DNA sequence: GAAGGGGGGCTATAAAAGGGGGTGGGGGCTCTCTTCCGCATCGC
């Protein structure tokens, strides 16, 4: 159960649905590294 | 009328002369998110 119990969190821990795609990972307040790496290279190191 | 023959032009070589023409080189498939438009609604 940990294990799902801790991806349901990281998917509510900011008071919204999160998706597991770009539009969500990518929109939390992360360093801009971390979300070129995931998806969308240039387009976040070019927001940044 | 086919075929061989004869005569003559073409080829290159130099050189001069002067001008026209030829040649080459410049120039005028699926899912998700965002944006725009029409509508009905109130407001003044």
Avoid: W
Avoid at 10 to 23: D, E, P, Q, S, Y
Avoid at 30 to 36: D, N, Q, S, V, Y
């Amino acid at each position: 159960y940990r294990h799902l119990a801790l991806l349901c969190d990281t998917m509510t821990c900011r008071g919204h649905l999160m998706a597991i795609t770009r539009h969500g990972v990518n929109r939390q307040d992360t360093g801009p590294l971390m979300k070129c790496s995931f998806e969308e290279t240039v387009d976040v190191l070019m927001e940044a």
